[PDB]
């Protein structure tokens, strides 16, 4: 019971690490998309104003 309790705690920490990394990477995924939206909006706006 002492050994399996620490086994449960270590698999919980492994899950917690997994959770930690994924959350960071969805944030990282989000970061890339937003900056691409900003770059796309700026280039469209800029190109039509210079034509104007």
């Amino acid at each position: 019971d002492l050994d399996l309790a620490k086994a449960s705690a270590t698999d919980q920490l492994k899950k917690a690490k997994a959770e930690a990394q994924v959350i960071i990477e969805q944030a990282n995924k989000r970061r890339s998309q937003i900056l691409d939206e900003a770059k796309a909006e700026a280039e469209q706006e800029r190109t039509k104003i210079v034509a104007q």
């Binding site: 706006e45 800029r46 104003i49 210079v50």
Partner: protein, 52 residues
């Protein structure tokens, strides 16, 4: 994008200056040659031999 058009502003002014100057002196050659006068030609010589 706005600072770019105010750079472009200066490029457009300068190109028109160049045009009018060169067509102005092209007119001036025709205008002055047709308006040559022997008293005025002598007056050129009479000026430069006074400072020479």
């Amino acid at each position: 994008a706005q600072a770019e058009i105010e750079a472009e502003r200066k490029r457009a002014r300068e190109e028109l200056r160049k045009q009018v100057a060169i067509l102005a002196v092209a007119g001036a050659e025709k205008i002055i040659e047709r308006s040559v006068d022997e008293a005025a030609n002598s007056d050129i010589v009479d000026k430069l031999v006074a400072e020479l």
